[PDB]
Amino acid sequence: SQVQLVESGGGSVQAGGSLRLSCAASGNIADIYYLGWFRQAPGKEREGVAALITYNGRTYYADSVKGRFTVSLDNAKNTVYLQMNSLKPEDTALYYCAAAYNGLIAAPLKVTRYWYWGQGTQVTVS
Amino acid sequence: MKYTICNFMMSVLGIIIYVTDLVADIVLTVRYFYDGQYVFGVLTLSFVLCGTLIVHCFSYSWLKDDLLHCLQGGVFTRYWFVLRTGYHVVFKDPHKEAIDMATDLSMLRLFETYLEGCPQLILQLYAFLERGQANFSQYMVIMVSCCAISWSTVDYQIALRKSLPDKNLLRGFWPKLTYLFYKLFTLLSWMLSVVLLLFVDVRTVLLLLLFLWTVGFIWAFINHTQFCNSLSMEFLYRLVVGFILVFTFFNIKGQNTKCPMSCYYTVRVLGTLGILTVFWIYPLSIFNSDYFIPISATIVLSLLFGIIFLGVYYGTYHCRIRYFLMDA
Ligand SMILES: CCCCCCCCCCCC(=O)OC[C@H](COP(=O)(O)OCC[N+](C)(C)C)OC(=O)CCCCCCCCCCC
C-alpha cells in the first residue's frame, strides 16, 4: 500500500451551521482518476456524497445533497476539501474518503467503483 | 500412441495447473472476504465448488460403471494413478491402460475448466474492469484460468488424436496451436462482450444465459447425444454441455455437417457486432470513452482473428471418446 489516505476536520456542529473536512493523499496520484466522499451511519449503506476528477475537475454530486456542498481539489498539496452548509441531523454519519483508478466504468458514486479507502472521520449534527 | 515422455510431461504439468488453480481460488475467496467483497467472494468459491461437484459426478459414475467411497474416487484420486502409470512407462498392454486413463482425465478437466474458468473469467474481468487496477491475487486467478483453458484445450486435443483413428490428419504442432489461439480469441471477444452487457443490467444478461442454456440443452436433446450408460446421469451431461455451448462451440456428437457451427458463429458475429453498434450509435453515459475504444478494438479484432483461425482450421484439416465432444 504505497498510497494512504489521511482524514481530518470531523466533529460535532450545530444543525444549520457549516463544517469543512480535509482529506490528504500520501504517495502518488498521477493515474488516480476519481476521488470522493461517502457517509456511513447505522441502518443504511454507503452513498456517494460527492466526487471530482483529478484531471478535469468535474464535481459529480448526489441528488440528496446537490447544490449544497462544495468539493474542490488543490494539486499543490494533493489534498481534497469538502465543505458542508446548512447541516441537518440526517447528515450525521461516518464520512469516508476514497480514491479510484481510471477504468471502463465512469460512475464516481458507486460504492464498489473505488479501489482503496481511508479511515474516515465522524461528523455529528445536532 | 505409446504414451511418450512428452505426454507424461503434459500430465505432470497438469497437476501444478490443477493445484495452483484450486489454491488460488481459495486465496482469492479469502481475500474477497477479508476485503469485504462478499458477493465476489461467494461467486468465486461457488464456480470452483459447483464445477468440481459436477465433475465428481462423472468421475464417480465412470469408475462405478467399470467396477468414504463418494470421495474415494474423486478427481485427485485419478491423478495419483495416472502419475504412477506414467512413471512406470518411463521406467519401462500397460500403455493402452495408461492412455485410456489419461483420456478419461481429459474429459473431466475439460468440464472442470469450462464450467469454472469461463464463468469465473467473466466475474474476474467484471471485477478488474470496474475498479480499474485490481490486485495481485486477482491477476493469478485470471492467469491460471487462462492457462487452465489453454492447457485443457491442448490436452483434450491430444486425447482425440490418440484415442480414435478418425483424427489422423490432426497430427502436427500447428493444429494444436491454431485451435488453441482459436479458443482464446473467440472467448476473449465473448468474455469482453458479456462484461459490457454485464455493466448496464445484470438481470437481463443472466436471463440471456438461461435462454442460451436452454437452447444448448435442447440442441443436445435434439442431437440425441448419449455419453453415460445411466439414464439419469446422462441428462447431467446433456445439461452441462448446454452450458458450455453458451461460451464456445464444441460440435456435439461430432456427426454434424458444419452447418450448426456456421449458424452458431453467424449469430456470434452479428450478435457481437450488433452489441457494439447499440453502444456506438447510441452513446452510454455509464461507460468511459477513454477506455471503451481500446475495448471496442479489442473485441472486434479478437473476433476478427478468432474467425480467421477457425477458417484456417477447416481449410487444412477437415473407444469411449467417440461420444464425447469432438471437432472444433
Ligand atoms: C481464455 C480467455 C482469455 C481471457 C484472459 C485474458 C484477459 C485479458 C484482459 C483484457 C482486459 C482489457 O481489455 O483491458 C483493456 C485494455 C486497456 O486499454 P489501454 O489503452 O491499453 O489502457 C492502458 C492505459 N493506461 C496506461 C493509463 C493504464 O485494452 C487493451 O489494450 C487490452 C488488449 C489485450 C488483448 C490484445 C489482443 C488484441 C489487440 C487489440 C488491442 C487494441
Numbering used by the authors:
A (entry chain B): 6 to 131
B (entry chain A): 1 to 67, 81 to 105, 119 to 344, 365 to 374
From the reporting publication:
The protein XKR9 is a member of a conserved family that has been associated with apoptotic lipid scrambling. Here, we describe structures of full-length and caspase-treated XKR9 from Rattus norvegicus in complex with a synthetic nanobody determined by cryo-electron microscopy. The 43 kDa monomeric membrane protein can be divided into two structurally related repeats, each containing four membrane-spanning segments and a helix that is partly inserted into the lipid bilayer. The rXKR9 structure consists of two consecutive domains (the N-terminal domain ND and C-terminal domain CD) with similar general organization containing four membrane-spanning helices each.
